[PDB]
Amino acid sequence: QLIAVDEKLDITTLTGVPEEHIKTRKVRIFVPARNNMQSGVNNTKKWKMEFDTRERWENPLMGWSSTADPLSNLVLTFSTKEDAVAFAEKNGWSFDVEERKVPKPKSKSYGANFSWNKRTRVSTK
Amino acid sequence: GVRTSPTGEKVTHTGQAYDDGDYRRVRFSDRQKEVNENFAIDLIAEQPVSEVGSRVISCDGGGGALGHPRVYINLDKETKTGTCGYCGLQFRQPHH
Amino acid sequence: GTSVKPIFSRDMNEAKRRVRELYRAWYREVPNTVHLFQLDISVKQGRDKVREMFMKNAHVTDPRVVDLLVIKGKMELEETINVWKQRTHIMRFFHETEAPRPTDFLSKFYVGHDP
Amino acid sequence: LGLREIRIHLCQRSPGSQGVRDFIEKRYVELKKANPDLPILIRECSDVQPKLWARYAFGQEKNVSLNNFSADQVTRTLENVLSGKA
Amino acid sequence: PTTKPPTARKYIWTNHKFNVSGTPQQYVPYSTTRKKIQEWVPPSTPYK
Amino acid sequence: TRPTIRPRNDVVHKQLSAFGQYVAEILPKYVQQVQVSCFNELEIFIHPDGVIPVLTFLRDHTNAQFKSLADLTAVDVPTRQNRFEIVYNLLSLRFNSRIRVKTYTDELTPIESSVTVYKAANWYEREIWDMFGVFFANHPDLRRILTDYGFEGHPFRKDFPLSGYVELRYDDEVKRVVAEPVELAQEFRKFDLNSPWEAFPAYRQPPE
Amino acid sequence: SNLIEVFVDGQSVMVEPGTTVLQACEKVGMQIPRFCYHERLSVAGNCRMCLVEIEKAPKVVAACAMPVMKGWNILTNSEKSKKAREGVMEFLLANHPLDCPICDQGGECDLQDQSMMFGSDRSRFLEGKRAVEDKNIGPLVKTIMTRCIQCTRCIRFASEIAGVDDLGTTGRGNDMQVGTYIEKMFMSELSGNIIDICPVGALTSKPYAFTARPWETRKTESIDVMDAVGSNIVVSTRTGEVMRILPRMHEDINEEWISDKTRFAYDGLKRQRLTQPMIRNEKGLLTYTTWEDALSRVAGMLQSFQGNDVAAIAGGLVDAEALVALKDLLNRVDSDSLCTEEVFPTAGAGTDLRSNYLLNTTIAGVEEADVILLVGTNPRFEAPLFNARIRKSWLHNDLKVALIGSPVDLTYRYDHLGDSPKILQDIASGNHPFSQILKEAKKPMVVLGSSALQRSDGTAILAAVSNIAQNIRLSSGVTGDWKVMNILHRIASQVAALDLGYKPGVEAIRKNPPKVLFLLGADGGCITRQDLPKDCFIIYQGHHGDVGAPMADVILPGAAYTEKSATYVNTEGRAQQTKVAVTPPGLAREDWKIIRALSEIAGMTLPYDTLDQVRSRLEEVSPNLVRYDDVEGANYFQQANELSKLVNQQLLADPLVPPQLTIKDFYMTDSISRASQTMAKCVKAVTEGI
């Protein structure tokens, strides 16, 4: 009832993607960096897969922004790095993986503001 | 406050005009170029500055709920006048 | 391990048998399709197109992928024989309105930034 | 026929590069004293066999593996490359 | 509008116009923004 | 709870929980999980092998007799090893109740067709095959139902682009409609709307 | 160990002593609301938005400031804490102006988002609001102080990070205002960061004003090239146009900040750009032409001449891919004269050993040091984030700083040893007491700037600094892998060029003038037509029209750092890669693609065809160029030290004077910054202030 065939998964021939949008693309798998304008960290929880930026030009009428690559807006979400890597490999996309950046824990001390001899003593508050 | 480009086209309030070598001007031949003749910057520059004997004044653009969100403007700086960020009206304290 | 449920074929041999059956069906159908749709292509180049479409997937070594491709090709043949397709659908395999894309490095460098 | 530059790619902690490392620590300076105008670029591999590249005139390059070589072996390889004899 | 007239505004058209499609007075769309990238102008004097 | 909050119904919650436990007890071979939502909806997560039995049971058991198939669809979750989840919504007129049955599959594993249990499934599975590429075994006639003839791919997959890969126009040289790679005069504007500062603490995940 | 047990919503978690309630909640994955608390700043505790209930405690505590106690059960979502959050948000919004449609911080406001998530949905404030007058602090930060919520983040950042104490609060109670109390510009190389830390639209970017909304922007994660720090950045674009530059967090390099030049010099990317190939006509003027014409014209001269008659110069913004492509192309001609504008001494080891030209201690290692000696450099303007790290260590670790050179303002107090380079020898001999100070140090650091190497005594200065470091190692012993010796670079392309085997300096060109010269982004003016033979064929490849383009015979338009995926190595030796945010304008192309096409036209075709193959070539030449976050390496200080004792060049009696003496010298350094109007406005503001 089981084949037990040994080969890496490959579904490129079944997805209908054109040839030049498989081998020429370079996906990036990363945890998005926090927007520095805000302190909330809820946007840095999941992994993202996104494609490489292609040409954008000006529409001769209306001066709008025109594109020719169909994957310009494609972003996928993943729970772990391994899941995204597996998806990319089974879809035949060359990928670059960036390790997650976590802000290291810090030593905070309110009393250090009023130091007797150290430089941590603040001049205003 | 519509001006005229050296080529002959009317310069819009955003300041746009095709340069002399621009082929896109061909779109206006046998037709016209849509330009609004009422320039908002000139029109708001014509409003007189209101004289108020208060340190802080509120502006909603007029008309009550038909205006813009009500904002409060400080008039401590005597060198300039307070300007509404929505409407462009100017307010000033009675110096001297 | 790596045990998976089959679709139609247990090993590659049954998959190739199904592929050959589908290829025979397409080869038989090509002349009738050429005549029925009043195509300006020849039977020879239609069969060349069938051969090229089959050869596009020649690198598959997974029987499940193979018989899924066979299922899709059989669906395509069903659409062609029953005249559910129009002339435009059949002629889409040939890309007659697309200007050719050069492959060499210099031409791609000249036309733009796209590799 | 003229040698242009030499590159030695060695790994920092791998056992296979150990002898190569010793080479430098013992005698790289002496080699540089004998070849003051020859660039011998020392760079670091990772999870990869040690290598020696030699570049000759008009961009010709040859590379020889230095995996598990002792210090004397890499010294002999460098002397062979430098003297021109194969 | 005879019994109660609309509010008068300086910017309101004093002369109403009809649909001017298929007419030299028709509207023609165009971009209203300025150049984004300015090209370098080479010098006019020969270098040597 | 004040007038702006949806009222709760504990009686239906208890009834649905009891019937879920009952179903799980009767078919332990296939039922992997049973859940009841806070708005009183019962779902049963089963192994793919049990599609025909469980559905048959839910259609034919005297205490269940869910005789109506309201909807059958799929959901694409790329992060899962089994990519697609197959959802059956069933309605029982005898007991005025609704149930949901969930299973899973990947790109290559077929799912048993349920046309023998419900005739209504015939088109639904076809639509799934068209939109997600899930193959149904022993379907009477499986083929595309929604896309154009010769369309490549399955649009409802997450990785399928919104505008697709080809577009259609009329060419006068060949005097017919032709398909060419997509080119937008104005590209679709991608908006990043998700805010930081999470909204619902009750759904917070462990930080692992 | 010493970990104590606390509870967050009944969940046990082990924390170090001194951990606050906020960090304890962080460890479980719950983010406490905040307005005044910042990780990188001192604790303030004034906004009271972090108030949370401790179980069996009648009073809510400020999570950002209160250390957690053993056995405490923090109730993050209890009714008391939610009511406290609602009350605090109501108070914060009572006097806030209804400016959201016209405020630049619309979709990026922590006030807006925290009001939506933790505040109420209506107001019961029936009074009039207060309005304060705006302040002018320069052309970079736009100020609308009616929106200010008095969190004092800007004051704390200016005092602690930037080292500038000009910001403060005046008045009392409801009319207390944040400002300077006098008309004064807050001008420092780190001044723009107060825009990021400000949670509201009180402080905004002035050049960015009214241009875009946050939900429109596409974010490209990339690397700065305005200096050699290699600070991680986010390029925010929209509809194919670069809209702004934001800092990207990297603890080891730039932490959370970027320099003002890095933030605001992107304006120059839209000006004086090279968009088409150009050649010389019969009149000797530059005229547009096709890629084929210019490339064939260059290839003809490339085939005509060979060997020593061909030369190339690399600028400060050149990536590794183009550098290796140019090196291969010139090697196929049998030309080895591949030079950089920056000078590094070639005597002894030279570029043979990588550690000879790196910041071996690394930027993070500054936090482990106890004494640092700076030689002939101004870290404040050459590497502003490195100077910020030094300031942070000085503030938190009581780091001792000494400088040899002109007494520039470094935003922290230091010991000025003097101006004469001879002092270095006096330190190496041992008569100077600073030799004893270095001897007693456990983690001593010596940093020599490349600007000091730009003078004719670079070899002797490097030898003296090496002697100082060698004496330190011989006396104090080997504490381990500390790597005392350090070199601080100023341009982004220097380390990659030295890794690839480029010759530092341009003295090879002066010794043997070429007949065909490649200017790969060379805009330093080191080599002119006067130093060259008559009818020298000059090729300029780059992205900006600057000092290098008008003297060229052929102009090849290239890509800027925002328009390619390219490799740059910072002063630490860490390799990083940018990403494409927008494509090059007009007919401009990727640089290594230009070089590969030229090689094909000239018949000396290079093996690589794609970016992956060029990076494989880079791995072949220098394998550390493909490790994209690694900063570890082997130390070869001993060999380089003995090799530096061969030559005995003498020092001149010229005081060490860095090129950047004041802030006005910091804004305009490269071709991108020289084409920026924002930097011109900054220069005008600092030179004369209103």
Ligand code: SF4
């Ligand atoms: S700072 Fe925030 S809340 Fe205040 S006006 Fe601006 S966007 Fe609105």
Ligand code: SF4
């Ligand atoms: S200006 Fe901004 S950062 Fe400074 S105190 Fe006011 S709200 Fe805080």
Ligand code: FES
């Ligand atoms: S965040 Fe703690 S009081 Fe402001």
Ligand SMILES: [Mg+2]
């Ligand atoms: Mg702000």
Ligand SMILES: [Zn+2]
């Ligand atoms: Zn108003």
